[PDB]
Design a protein around this nucleic acid. Structure first.
Lengths: 75, 295, 295, 75, 295, 295
DNA sequence: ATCTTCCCTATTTAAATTGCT
DNA sequence: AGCAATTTAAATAGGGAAGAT
């Protein structure tokens, strides 16, 4: 299932995101991750992006909708 | 470990060439020699093919061992003339499911059943051909392909000797090569040293087939050194049974279409990850080897 | 950094730490941090080891595998492996399950032979204790510990079925817990989910014993999913089963000697691999696999 | 043509890349624009991005082929 | 100055709601009332639409008008059965070419060519329903739809009076409303006030049809004030004659599909954009109003 | 800020600069920079224009275009038009082309009526030379200039073909360029690409000369693409045609003074909108086009 | 060797505001 | 309303560098 994660966060809390989102998602460019995942992969990635810290502004796009709105994101 | 993505729906396959695969800030990345790192989805990958000119570190094997990544070293010994040896590192630290091997060795041992199953890994090909369909190659409802799969059906069913099944498998594969040669209007004698785009995409797709086949071997826990079909031409274990199902029925239309449409190396590499997950040629091989184990 | 562990006679495990295994001037080498490359022997090594901080290229991989020498990866110490390819007859000219693998399958696939093999691997306990005494804990030749030994050397020989063997193994484990508690004047109840230093050090030594047991089963291609004693649903029961020979004879006093002197986790690791390197206890475990299967 | 422009530049030149890329594509996220361009809007945009200056680092993926790679962009 | 991207090749289409359309750092960008702004195209948009609460600046209009962007305001319809008034600002600054309404007012004044042009612009939709098929909803030409399109072609060809064209057009729209009600299994009627998903999405789609059309007519010069189906119900112009060609054929199936499969407002918006670009709906209208003009 | 330009009956043409045209107490209002809120006279406006730096909401435009006032965008003086609606009939309950445009296109169809209309509009070139007299320009009643105006009168009362009418127009405008260059004691050839100041501000003023033409024809409803004196292949020809009224009579001596005092673009723009409001040029053009049609 | 945790250093972005059109 | 400078923190690459295995 095709998801696309964009991290609109600050850089010290973006390397800690990029440690965990790049476990499941390909790097397509400029703090955005686009690649293929399963539903339990979605659940595990949301769980381990919630638990990293504060300021984890992250938007996930399934099709053209949104999956997560972690942090006070601009979306 | 938490819950962890199962080894049936990991969908990021890679053959990396000319790049030191290392661990950077907890991410598996290939540092290419130009100086740029590229992060690899180490928990969404089923295999990492280390092609010509690469090197992997031990911390980059610890993070691809716990996360269930089939690291195989490709060339040098992998000339694939007789499919001799691709040096394939299975993550052995995880205690895999044991009720799969204790039934599979029972299969291997009793020869009557070996043949019965051999027949079925050979009958899984016509099943993979009929179910997994493409929209650019040939019709599977065509009379030529129906004729050759029916000839292979009647070859598999009445034969009660492994050389006869090897000859039936042989001719099935070879005539499929010739049928795809005639329908795509191009001569094709599959020599592995030949550097045409058809043969190069075929031997890349066969490495992809080795990767998901050996991933289905590892997730089951079944060691490769217990082959259902052993003999003179067929060397390398049973991973060349679990790859040769999808070889005549997925990657060969994919390779032939990839070189007919002028798609590049990385574009066929992308297409053979996309298709390999659209109809999950992974959990098909998982749940159908589980159909082979069964009793 | 570079170390040698014996397998049987001259086939030797060469654990390389902190290096760069690359082809240097034709043959393979390993460049350490002090700039000294060394050419690794080809006929005096068959299992080459890759410990922490090592990276090996595809030229080194392919030419090492092409002349008999087969790689495995491991953590710090050489006894904590996580990824390899399986042992075959020879990796170049054939692909076959090993003779030790075939004979172990003949043991596993007959109930009486699996039973008589189970009494054997249980009866290696006394030998393990006697061969490797420490200067730390109880001596083998005292009254109550040799009474425990006599309880095995009577009861294991005429035990009927497998749950009887599990009952005696439980009595020996919970009974040397009493003896090694009396040596160090503490009170023991075995719980892996506890937080005292004795139990957590014992479970770290247990994992450290599982690692070398997995390596010793790998060294002949013996699959990890074929337990003599534990049930058919226990994942990786053979790792625990061929670990139990060293778990109560070397691991238990070590975990206890370590905890007494209150040293750290890495100090535990280096003391385990020092004592584990001194008496070639890995080589003992391969000699036990050959004694179990060959007959 | 669905082309996806990612500007891997530094701010001073990136705001200028944003100004001419904003005419033809819409913002998707973190200096990555993605939208439908016709057949010659991509040529006009390539010329308008070449004349942005020194420091233009723009990649553009039609299908997955790199269409244009202005500057020393990362592959 | 180069040549500018053609109007018939412009792709992004907007209906922008609740914002403050402004220019910041030289790009048109609409300030939603969160404090955050979104960058909108100005050179690859063929219209922006402005719903309740939006406010355009002058410099925004400058950029858009110079670049060739039709702009209209959604609210203003206050009747019970009609989309009454869409106040629309066409870019008059650029001098649009003369060649086409110098021939369109020629047909507009001579009533026999006005009548014949009304026939041909009424067969516009019966060829538009055939050249832009769908993969969903109604079988483009089944039994019912083919019956009404044949009945309509006969009815428009036998009619030499302008109210009769309005009558047959009314039966046309009402009975594909009926046929799409049966195919999408719901009871639906056109009312601009009903909160029915279908009705709502169809109102948004007719706003989009207004835009492509108004832009089709700017590009070719033709004003709105020169209609070709004038009558009692139709008091909007040419836009609403060229707009409904691509409403009964492009919009109404899309509105019904976006109503069933749970599409949002932005989902229906994006579907409009994609479908219109794929079918070159605007290139259809500019290249087919043309054959009404000079052929 | 607030501006007011004459039109046919009243000063019903309001230009708003630097103010967010909002809506307060059920009436469109203006919120300026100073902070003062004004109101729109609903009977002394049916035309309203918006200059540089403004904004207007949906609830402002929908309320504003329901009572009968129509919104149009301009540069800064209220003449250089970006975007607008078409001045149609009563824009709430009807949508028809005006009576004012219909007589103009009846002029457009017939060659004799279009010829007599060309004679008329080219005679009000002489009328606009007479009625807008420049103290800082020349004495237009003198013998050297009256020779040129009788050259036009004799030519346009005797012209039978358009090709000679254009030549007589050209020799008139060329003689005015030569005489006006003789008064400021300079040499001058009309070139649109020359970097001299005289040509630069002549073309600059010629732009707003075309701008008032756009505003004047928009107001009458006339599409600016039915050119009288210019050919049918000239895009937006009617603009330059009704601008021919003033390009030699206000814009030419003002541009020459702008290049004779050194007044740059900004000062010239100031003088433009000054003379363009005080002596009522937009009203002069709007009754001029009226008189070309009503007769 | 490899990786990582650090931190000190420039230094690269960003937002507040003046001054003008 | 919109465009620049123009400071102004301040956030941000980044290059050895010390510990671990």
């Amino acid at each position: 299932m095709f998801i696309r994660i964009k991290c609109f966060s600050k850089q010290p809390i973006a390397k800690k995101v990029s440690r965990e989102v790049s476990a499941y998602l390909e790097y397509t460019g400029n703090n955005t991750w686009e690649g293929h995942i399963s539903g339990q992969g979605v659940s595990n990635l949301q769980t381990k992006l919630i638990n990293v810290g504060k300021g984890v502004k992250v938007v996930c796009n399934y099709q053209d909708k949104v999956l997560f709105a972690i942090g006070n994101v601009a979306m | 470990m938490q819950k962890q993505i199962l080894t049936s729906q990991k969908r990021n396959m890679y053959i990396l060439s000319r790049c030191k695969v290392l661990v950077k800030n907890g991410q598996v990345c290939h540092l290419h020699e130009d100086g740029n790192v590229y992060t690899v989805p180490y928990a969404n990958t089923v295999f990492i093919g280390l092609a010509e000119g690469t090197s992997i570190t031990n911390e980059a094997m610890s993070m691809l061992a716990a996360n269930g990544v089939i690291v195989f070293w490709t060339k040098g010994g992998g000339y694939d003339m007789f499919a001799a040896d691709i040096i394939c590192h299975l993550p052995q630290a995880d205690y895999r499911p044991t009720k799969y091997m204790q039934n599979w060795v029972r299969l291997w041992l009793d020869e009557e059943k070996k043949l019965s199953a051999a027949k079925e890994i050979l009958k899984m090909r016509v099943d993979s051909l009929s179910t997994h369909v493409h929209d650019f190659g040939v019709d599977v409802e065509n009379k030529r392909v129906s004729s050759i799969v029916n000839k292979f059906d009647k070859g598999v069913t009445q034969a009660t000797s492994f050389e006869s099944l090897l000859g039936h498998e042989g001719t099935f594969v070879k005539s499929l090569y010739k049928e795809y040669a005639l329908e795509y209007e191009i001569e094709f004698k599959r020599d592995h040293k030949s550097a045409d785009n058809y043969n190069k995409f075929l031997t890349l797709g066969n490495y992809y087939a080795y990767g998901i086949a050996r991933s289905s071997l590892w997730a089951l826990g079944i060691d490769n050194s217990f082959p259902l079909l052993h003999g003179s031409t067929r060397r390398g274990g049973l991973v060349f049974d679990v790859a040769d199902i999808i070889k005549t029925s997925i990657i060969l239309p994919l390779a032939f279409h990839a070189a007919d449409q002028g798609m590049s190396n990385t574009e066929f590499k992308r297409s053979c990850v996309a298709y390999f997950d659209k109809n999950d040629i992974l959990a098909y091989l998982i749940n159908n080897i589980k159909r082979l184990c069964m009793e």
